[PDB]
Motif scaffolding. Structure first.
Motif, PDB file in Angstrom:
ATOM      1  N   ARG G 178       0.520  -1.019  -0.222  1.00  0.00           N
ATOM      2  CA  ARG G 178       0.297  -0.130  -0.319  1.00  0.00           C
ATOM      3  C   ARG G 178       0.840   1.188  -0.102  1.00  0.00           C
ATOM      4  O   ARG G 178       0.123   2.463  -0.419  1.00  0.00           O
ATOM      5  CB  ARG G 178      -1.100   0.005   1.267  1.00  0.00           C
ATOM      6  CG  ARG G 178      -1.951  -1.052   1.011  1.00  0.00           C
ATOM      7  CD  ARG G 178      -2.969  -1.347   2.310  1.00  0.00           C
ATOM      8  NE  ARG G 178      -3.544   0.248   3.156  1.00  0.00           N
ATOM      9  CZ  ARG G 178      -4.753   0.244   3.522  1.00  0.00           C
ATOM     10  NH1 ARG G 178      -4.665  -0.731   4.747  1.00  0.00           N
ATOM     11  NH2 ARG G 178      -5.428   1.611   3.796  1.00  0.00           N
ATOM     12  N   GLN G 179       2.094   1.070   0.363  1.00  0.00           N
ATOM     13  CA  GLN G 179       2.861   2.978   0.314  1.00  0.00           C
ATOM     14  C   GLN G 179       3.656   3.044  -1.348  1.00  0.00           C
ATOM     15  O   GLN G 179       3.688   3.288  -2.077  1.00  0.00           O
ATOM     16  CB  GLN G 179       3.993   2.567   1.214  1.00  0.00           C
ATOM     17  CG  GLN G 179       3.815   4.036   1.583  1.00  0.00           C
ATOM     18  CD  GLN G 179       3.184   4.612   1.852  1.00  0.00           C
ATOM     19  OE1 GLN G 179       2.822   4.194   3.584  1.00  0.00           O
ATOM     20  NE2 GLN G 179       2.737   6.026   1.704  1.00  0.00           N
ATOM     21  N   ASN G 180       4.068   1.359  -1.885  1.00  0.00           N
ATOM     22  CA  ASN G 180       5.263   1.732  -2.892  1.00  0.00           C
ATOM     23  C   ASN G 180       4.763   0.922  -3.734  1.00  0.00           C
ATOM     24  O   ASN G 180       5.880   1.236  -4.893  1.00  0.00           O
ATOM     25  CB  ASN G 180       6.580   1.400  -2.601  1.00  0.00           C
ATOM     26  CG  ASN G 180       6.951   2.233  -1.092  1.00  0.00           C
ATOM     27  OD1 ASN G 180       6.827   1.414   0.075  1.00  0.00           O
ATOM     28  ND2 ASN G 180       7.301   2.931  -0.799  1.00  0.00           N
ATOM     29  N   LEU G 181       3.907   0.152  -3.609  1.00  0.00           N
ATOM     30  CA  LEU G 181       3.178  -0.733  -4.479  1.00  0.00           C
ATOM     31  C   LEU G 181       2.447  -0.490  -6.125  1.00  0.00           C
ATOM     32  O   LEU G 181       2.466  -0.377  -6.979  1.00  0.00           O
ATOM     33  CB  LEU G 181       3.752  -2.060  -4.751  1.00  0.00           C
ATOM     34  CG  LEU G 181       4.335  -3.262  -5.177  1.00  0.00           C
ATOM     35  CD1 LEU G 181       4.521  -3.208  -6.320  1.00  0.00           C
ATOM     36  CD2 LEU G 181       5.629  -3.076  -3.986  1.00  0.00           C
ATOM     37  N   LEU G 182       1.020  -0.307  -4.937  1.00  0.00           N
ATOM     38  CA  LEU G 182      -0.932   0.076  -5.520  1.00  0.00           C
ATOM     39  C   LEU G 182      -0.560   2.047  -6.107  1.00  0.00           C
ATOM     40  O   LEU G 182      -1.347   2.654  -5.976  1.00  0.00           O
ATOM     41  CB  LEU G 182      -1.439  -0.154  -4.548  1.00  0.00           C
ATOM     42  CG  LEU G 182      -1.680  -1.974  -4.626  1.00  0.00           C
ATOM     43  CD1 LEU G 182      -2.906  -2.292  -3.692  1.00  0.00           C
ATOM     44  CD2 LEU G 182      -1.784  -2.649  -5.862  1.00  0.00           C
ATOM     45  N   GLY G 183       0.440   2.627  -5.187  1.00  0.00           N
ATOM     46  CA  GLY G 183       0.726   4.086  -5.836  1.00  0.00           C
ATOM     47  C   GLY G 183       2.203   4.452  -5.581  1.00  0.00           C
ATOM     48  O   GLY G 183       2.815   3.787  -3.949  1.00  0.00           O
ATOM     49  N   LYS G 184       2.514   5.579  -5.564  1.00  0.00           N
ATOM     50  CA  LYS G 184       4.300   5.427  -5.551  1.00  0.00           C
ATOM     51  C   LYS G 184       4.359   7.800  -6.027  1.00  0.00           C
ATOM     52  O   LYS G 184       3.266   7.961  -5.729  1.00  0.00           O
ATOM     53  CB  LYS G 184       4.497   5.488  -7.019  1.00  0.00           C
ATOM     54  CG  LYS G 184       4.306   3.999  -7.510  1.00  0.00           C
ATOM     55  CD  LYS G 184       5.799   3.546  -8.472  1.00  0.00           C
ATOM     56  CE  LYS G 184       5.906   2.137  -8.225  1.00  0.00           C
ATOM     57  NZ  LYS G 184       4.752   1.014  -8.344  1.00  0.00           N
ATOM     58  N   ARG G 185       5.083   8.113  -5.468  1.00  0.00           N
ATOM     59  CA  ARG G 185       5.315   9.272  -5.397  1.00  0.00           C
ATOM     60  C   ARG G 185       5.982   9.342  -6.998  1.00  0.00           C
ATOM     61  O   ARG G 185       6.533   8.666  -7.151  1.00  0.00           O
ATOM     62  CB  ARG G 185       5.868  10.399  -4.291  1.00  0.00           C
ATOM     63  CG  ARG G 185       5.811  10.077  -2.838  1.00  0.00           C
ATOM     64  CD  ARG G 185       6.986  11.304  -2.214  1.00  0.00           C
ATOM     65  NE  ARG G 185       6.144  11.760  -0.671  1.00  0.00           N
ATOM     66  CZ  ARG G 185       4.668  12.242  -0.366  1.00  0.00           C
ATOM     67  NH1 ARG G 185       4.477  12.558  -0.871  1.00  0.00           N
ATOM     68  NH2 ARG G 185       4.599  11.753   0.617  1.00  0.00           N
ATOM     69  N   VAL G 186       5.510  10.290  -7.928  1.00  0.00           N
ATOM     70  CA  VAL G 186       5.929  10.329  -8.726  1.00  0.00           C
ATOM     71  C   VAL G 186       7.273  12.086  -9.747  1.00  0.00           C
ATOM     72  O   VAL G 186       6.571  12.787  -8.876  1.00  0.00           O
ATOM     73  CB  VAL G 186       4.793  10.915 -10.596  1.00  0.00           C
ATOM     74  CG1 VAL G 186       4.134   9.131  -9.775  1.00  0.00           C
ATOM     75  CG2 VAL G 186       3.890  11.322  -9.761  1.00  0.00           C
ATOM     76  N   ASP G 187       7.717  11.741 -10.575  1.00  0.00           N
ATOM     77  CA  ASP G 187       7.989  12.914 -11.253  1.00  0.00           C
ATOM     78  C   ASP G 187       7.020  13.846 -12.504  1.00  0.00           C
ATOM     79  O   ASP G 187       6.107  13.300 -12.578  1.00  0.00           O
ATOM     80  CB  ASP G 187       9.328  12.155 -12.396  1.00  0.00           C
ATOM     81  CG  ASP G 187      10.723  11.648 -11.673  1.00  0.00           C
ATOM     82  OD1 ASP G 187      10.828  12.333 -10.820  1.00  0.00           O
ATOM     83  OD2 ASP G 187      11.082  10.814 -11.937  1.00  0.00           O
ATOM     84  N   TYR G 188       7.429  15.104 -12.710  1.00  0.00           N
ATOM     85  CA  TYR G 188       6.506  15.502 -13.557  1.00  0.00           C
ATOM     86  C   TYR G 188       5.486  15.806 -12.697  1.00  0.00           C
ATOM     87  O   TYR G 188       4.590  15.616 -13.706  1.00  0.00           O
ATOM     88  CB  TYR G 188       6.194  14.755 -15.041  1.00  0.00           C
ATOM     89  CG  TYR G 188       7.897  14.170 -15.601  1.00  0.00           C
ATOM     90  CD1 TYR G 188       8.385  15.391 -15.615  1.00  0.00           C
ATOM     91  CD2 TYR G 188       8.328  13.526 -15.769  1.00  0.00           C
ATOM     92  CE1 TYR G 188      10.155  15.146 -16.535  1.00  0.00           C
ATOM     93  CE2 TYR G 188       9.817  13.292 -16.332  1.00  0.00           C
ATOM     94  CZ  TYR G 188       9.756  14.190 -16.720  1.00  0.00           C
ATOM     95  OH  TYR G 188      11.830  13.858 -17.321  1.00  0.00           O
ATOM     96  N   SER G 189       5.829  16.686 -11.702  1.00  0.00           N
ATOM     97  CA  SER G 189       4.223  16.530 -11.087  1.00  0.00           C
ATOM     98  C   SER G 189       4.646  18.315 -10.572  1.00  0.00           C
ATOM     99  O   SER G 189       5.511  18.330  -9.844  1.00  0.00           O
ATOM    100  CB  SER G 189       3.740  15.538  -9.736  1.00  0.00           C
ATOM    101  OG  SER G 189       4.496  15.395  -8.983  1.00  0.00           O
ATOM    102  N   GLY G 190       3.153  18.893  -9.188  1.00  0.00           N
ATOM    103  CA  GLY G 190       3.274  19.825  -9.109  1.00  0.00           C
ATOM    104  C   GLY G 190       2.952  19.860  -8.364  1.00  0.00           C
ATOM    105  O   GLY G 190       1.214  19.663  -8.466  1.00  0.00           O
ATOM    106  N   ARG G 191       1.994  21.068  -7.306  1.00  0.00           N
ATOM    107  CA  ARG G 191       1.057  22.352  -6.719  1.00  0.00           C
ATOM    108  C   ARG G 191       0.856  23.008  -6.173  1.00  0.00           C
ATOM    109  O   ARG G 191       1.821  23.707  -6.177  1.00  0.00           O
ATOM    110  CB  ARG G 191       1.134  20.726  -4.989  1.00  0.00           C
ATOM    111  CG  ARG G 191      -0.286  21.097  -4.228  1.00  0.00           C
ATOM    112  CD  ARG G 191       0.784  20.045  -2.746  1.00  0.00           C
ATOM    113  NE  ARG G 191       0.071  18.874  -3.417  1.00  0.00           N
ATOM    114  CZ  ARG G 191      -1.235  18.884  -2.835  1.00  0.00           C
ATOM    115  NH1 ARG G 191      -2.218  19.047  -2.002  1.00  0.00           N
ATOM    116  NH2 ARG G 191      -2.306  17.586  -4.073  1.00  0.00           N
TER     117      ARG G 191
END
Ligand SMILES: Nc1nc2c(ncn2[C@@H]2O[C@H](COP(=O)(O)OP(=O)(O)OP(=O)(O)O)[C@@H](O)[C@H]2O)c(=O)[nH]1
Ligand SMILES: [Zn+2]
Lengths: 346, 49, 49, 192, 96, 48, 193
Positions: G178-191
């Motif tokens: 549930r932390q690194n496999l079904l979801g991840k932090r990603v590049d090319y993103s901002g907020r």
DNA sequence: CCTGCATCAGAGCCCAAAA
DNA sequence: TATAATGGGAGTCTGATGCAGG
RNA sequence: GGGG
């Protein structure tokens, strides 16, 4: 269900020794050691090998393994072969076999009856980085040492001698195993000295001592610089899983970049650098690129200096230093036009 | 409360030192190690929630 | 150009931040009153408004 | 070839060894002065691979022209340092140990196979009770010991070492029986 | 986080959003080239600065971690092809 | 004051226990250079 | 008896009785799974409902091993695997300080107890001592694989924090899945706001 | 046979998260 | 390596399921 | 503890 409580119950099943019982067992162990020495002479065997063979039959078939140092794999075949040579001895020689066997038996009982002593010493050493049971097992290790070295003739009670060996074993255990980064036992002693020293110094001064105040209190050989370096060495590592914040959802390791693996930018850069470097040695001549390329190596690193360069470039030996300069020289002129390589100097 | 815990820990050091090393040549200054007390107070202020 | 013994680790400015430098504090080892955590020669603080 | 399936299965001790590149013999981690890994310890390069790309430990062979060489002096393979994420070690246990998932995940998988309750499997695994492989004609409290029977420690000592008792004689009082004499239960040995 | 120059977290519920739209190649990018697929992300950056299109992704490194962690638990995790033959996702690096 | 329950010996000395943090005038603390606040805690009163 | 000139025989048997996972590995080896299937199938033909129910649950584990090809004694470990080092790192942080994964302390505990056990065996320690060492080894293996599962959670000294074991890494909200496999932090993103 | 009864494994997302 | 020393200290609420018990 |  509680591992300490269980062990306390098991030791309480071996009664403590009477002064007579204590002397009796101790006596039999010593005589047995002397018996094994004599059995070595008579038989032409090894005193240790005999001792492990004698010991094997007392404890039973349960424990059979190779023992570090023994010449024979100590499997049922070898202990039967060697035991049959010992039981084939004449009555006056064979009496020593019976002595060794009874020596080992008494040793077992002697060790078992003194286990409660180890507990009472180990409980005082808790909190130093080893668990209570770890301290008991190291304490038991010293007790085994003590049983083998005890001389009953000195008329001392066993508890007196054992305590030295048990205290010695626990203290060595704490010094060897308590640190993630292992420290030499003697060096741990020095660090502990600085602690005690500073703790005295803080108690007289009513405030923390400087490095210099500790260096004076430590005597000659110590300056402030050495006190600091010692403290740097004494720093224990911290868990990557240490929580940050009251929410239970943040780890310290998550704030640590990976500095080893090249980043996409850097990996990209390394491919681009190799591509401009080869596409640059060929725009002069491949052969003067071939001589220069051998003198450093793309993915190899072939820089000597003068000897080795004797073989295959194509010329004899001083000449390659010269074409190294014209390759490097034409490269230098050729560089001012295609000045794309300047930016790779960072 | 944190002070009371730190004081009781220092007492463990006192009782254990009143058994080892000679039952006579000890003053109060050598008998007391203040490390447990200092850590409890420093622990409360720097890390309590 | 000889490859230098040292590399550029300078402290810079994060993306999106910056201002006017209003103060600097520099603390070395071997200056009156200051001793840093073990191994640390000097600490520099820059306050930007 | 393309990945179409993922299977998960138990690993034999042979297979666990089939993965392993070396045995970790020491609790040591890295050397306190050099900060490099301790030989035969948890970070040893002789087991899990080189710290630097295509470079051995002592530095005799430093680049990629050698890939697959194992340095005679220091023992480290020359390959990508990335392998320290992949290559497994192993620890060779002196006595076997149960994998807790197959014990404590209820109903126990080991327990169901051997027809052993939750309480029994705890007691054998955590050294509270014996379980008999071969009674060798033993009998306890009038009934014969049958294989897969659980014995307490006291029960085992009576079977394995025999039963005996020692009675103190008040000081100076002489015994009413002689050394070597067969004795019935209840017989009087000394005045008290 | 901003102070580490971090990336945004694209979490379980965000994957569901991409899934319900059926945008598979967008989703696969989030799971590989824009995160822990090392061969892919290095290769993808090189393509954008050269004007080429980004390559098809490779195995994400956090799955390899998962495999090795199950081996540390003495479980054999095997990637298989359609013929039920083992597939090596470590490209020879972990086998003797 | 040290008392020996066996003997009678009395040695008395003033021992240094370390430092205690002081509260400022406005009700806050300074801990490692940063100003801090201790928040009161509601809980069940002892009793029966 | 060399004094009394008599050979005593103390009544007792050559009985084989064992403790621990070593005993169990033998009982698991002494399983012929084919036979136990046969036995449980014959028992599957029986009233009282409860008899048929338990023979089924047992028969499912038997059949599980049979179809799969797994030997039951593999549920007992002889060699314990060691995860690659870059997955449990010892890294120098910014300050020159070292930060290290909890798995290293769990492995160190295991290695020490194993080494001590090898030494106590070679020196022929009594059965009480070898027994204590062996049960501590189980607890060390138990903490390594799933810590806190059975018994007191292993902690670093002077901390209440349970050490993070292999099971904790795999499972839960913070776990590998549930932390690194079904979801991840990603590049090319901002907020932003 | 059936029912109390325990032991276990669950308890929303993203961001600051000021260590 | 030798007075003798021999048994420890310490902390909510939900629903599902596999267990010894009137 | 703080933002939606
Ligand atoms: N899931 C979740 N949503 C949150 C949280 N905090 C704030 N929100 C968001 O806050 C928003 C509340 O919006 P409101 O202003 O109350 O919307 P509303 O129904 O129009 O109410 P009014 O504006 O007063 O008419 C929701 O849309 C949530 O998504 C949170 O902690 N969790
Ligand atoms: Zn080398």
């Amino acid at each position: 269900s509680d591992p300490v409580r269980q062990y306390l119950h098991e030791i309480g099943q071996v009664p403590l020794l009477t002064l007579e019982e204590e002397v009796e067992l101790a006596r039999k162990v010593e005589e047995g050691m002397e018996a094994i020495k004599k059995l070595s002479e008579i038989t032409g065997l090894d005193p240790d090998l005999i001792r492990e063979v004698v010991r094997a039959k007392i404890l039973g078939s349960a424990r059979v393994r190779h023992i570090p140092g023994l010449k024979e794999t100590l499997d049922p075949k070898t202990v039967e072969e060697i035991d049959q040579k010992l039981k084939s001895l004449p009555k006056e020689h064979k009496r020593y076999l019976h002595i060794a066997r009874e020596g080992e038996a008494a040793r077992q009982h002697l060790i078992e009856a003194n286990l409660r002593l180890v507990v009472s010493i180990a409980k005082k050493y808790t909190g130093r980085g080893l668990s209570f049971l770890d301290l008991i097992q190291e304490g038991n290790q010293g007790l085994i040492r003590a049983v083998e070295k005890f001389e009953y003739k000195r008329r001392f009670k066993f508890s007196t001698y054992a305590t030295w060996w048990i205290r010695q074993a626990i203290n060595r255990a704490i010094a060897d195993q308590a640190r993630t980064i292992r420290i030499p036992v003697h060096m741990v002693e020095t660090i502990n000295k600085l602690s005690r020293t500073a703790r005295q110094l803080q108690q007289e001064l009513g405030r923390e001592p400087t490095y210099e105040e500790i260096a004076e209190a430590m005597g000659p050989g110590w300056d402030a610089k050495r006190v600091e370096e010692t403290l740097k060495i004494a720093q224990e590592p911290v868990s990557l899983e240490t929580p940050i914040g009251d929410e239970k959802d943040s780890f310290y390791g998550d704030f640590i970049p990976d500095e080893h693996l090249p980043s996409p930018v850097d990996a990209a850069t390394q491919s681009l650098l190799s591509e401009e470097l080869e596409k640059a040695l060929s725009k002069l001549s491949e052969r003067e690129a071939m001589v220069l390329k051998l003198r450093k190596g793309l993915i190899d690193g072939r820089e000597h200096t003068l000897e080795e360069v004797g073989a295959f470039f194509g010329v004899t030996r001083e000449r390659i230093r010269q074409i190294e300069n014209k390759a490097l020289r034409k490269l230098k002129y050729h560089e001012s036009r295609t000045r794309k390589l300047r930016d790779f100097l960072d | 409360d944190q002070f009371r815990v730190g004081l009781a820990r220092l007492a463990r050091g006192v009782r254990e030192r009143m058994l080892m090393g000679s039952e006579d040549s000890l003053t109060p200054a050598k008998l007391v190690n203040s490390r447990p007390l200092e850590a409890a107070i420093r622990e409360f202020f720097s890390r309590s929630q | 150009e000889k490859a230098r013994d040292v590399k550029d680790t300078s402290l810079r400015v994060p993306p999106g931040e910056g201002g006017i430098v209003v103060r600097t504090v520099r603390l070395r080892r071997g200056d009156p009153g200051v001793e840093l955590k073990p191994g640390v020669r000097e600490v520099v603080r820059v306050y930007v408004a | 070839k393309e990945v179409r399936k993922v299977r998960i299965a138990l690993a034999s001790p042979e297979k666990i060894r089939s993965w392993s590149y070396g045995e970790v013999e020491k609790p040591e981690t890295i050397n306190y002065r050099t900060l490099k890994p301790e030989r035969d310890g948890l970070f040893d390069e002789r087991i899990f691979g080189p710290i630097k790309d295509y470079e051995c430990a002592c530095g005799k062979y430093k680049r990629q022209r050698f890939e697959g060489k194992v340095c005679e002096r220091c023992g480290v393979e020359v390959t990508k340092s990335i392998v320290r994420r992949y290559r497994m070690g192993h620890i060779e246990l002196a006595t076997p140990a149960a994998h807790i998932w197959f014990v404590k995940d209820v109903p126990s998988k080991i327990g169901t196979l051997l027809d052993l309750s939750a309480t029994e499997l705890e007691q054998v695994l955590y050294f509270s009770k014996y379980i008999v492989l071969d009674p060798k004609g033993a009998i306890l409290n009038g009934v014969p010991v049958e294989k897969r029977q659980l014995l307490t420690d006291e029960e085992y000592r009576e079977l394995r070492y025999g039963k005996q008792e020692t009675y103190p004689l008040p000081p100076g009082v002489d015994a009413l029986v002689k050394d070597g004499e067969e004795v019935v239960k209840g017989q009087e040995l000394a005045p008290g | 986080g901003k102070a580490q120059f971090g990336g945004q977290r694209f979490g379980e519920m965000e994957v569901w959003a991409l899934e319900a739209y059926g945008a598979a190649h967008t989703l696969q990018e989030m799971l590989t080239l824009k995160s822990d697929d090392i061969e892919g992300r290095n290769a993808a950056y090189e393509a954008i600065i050269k004007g080429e299109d980004v390559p098809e992704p490779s195995v994400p490194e956090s799955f390899r971690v998962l495999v090795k962690e199950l081996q540390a638990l003495a479980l054999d995790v095997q990637t298989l092809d359609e013929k039920d033959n083992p597939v090596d996702i470590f490209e020879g690096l972990a086998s003797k | 004051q040290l008392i020996h329950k066996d003997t009678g010996l009395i040695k008395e000395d003033e021992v240094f226990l370390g430092h205690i943090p002081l509260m400022t005038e406005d009700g806050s603390f300074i801990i490692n250079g940063a100003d801090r606040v201790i928040v009161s805690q509601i809980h069940r009163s002892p009793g029966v | 008896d060399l004094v009394r000139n008599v050979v005593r025989v103390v009544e007792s048997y050559d009985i084989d009785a064992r403790m621990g996972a070593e005993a169990i590995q033998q009982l698991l080896k002494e399983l012929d799974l084919e036979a136990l299937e046969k036995e449980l199938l014959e028992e599957m033909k029986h009233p009282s409902r409860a008899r048929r129910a338990k023979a089924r649950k047992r028969l499912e584990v038997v059949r599980a091993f049979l179809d799969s090809g797994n030997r039951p004694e593999w549920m007992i470990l002889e060699a314990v695997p060691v995860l690659p080092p870059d997955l449990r790192p010892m890294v120098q942080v910014d300050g020159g300080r070292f930060a290290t994964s909890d798995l290293n302390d769990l492995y160190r505990r295991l290695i020490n107890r194993n080494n001590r056990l090898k030494k106590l065996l070679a020196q022929g320690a009594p059965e009480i001592i070898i027994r204590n060492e062996k049960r501590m080894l189980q607890e060390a293996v138990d903490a390594l694989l799933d810590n806190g599962r059975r018994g007191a959670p292993v902690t670093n000294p002077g901390s209440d924090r349970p050490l993070r074991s292999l099971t904790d890494i795999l499972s839960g909200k913070q776990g590998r899945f549930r932390q690194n496999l079904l979801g991840k932090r990603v590049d090319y993103s901002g907020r932003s706001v």
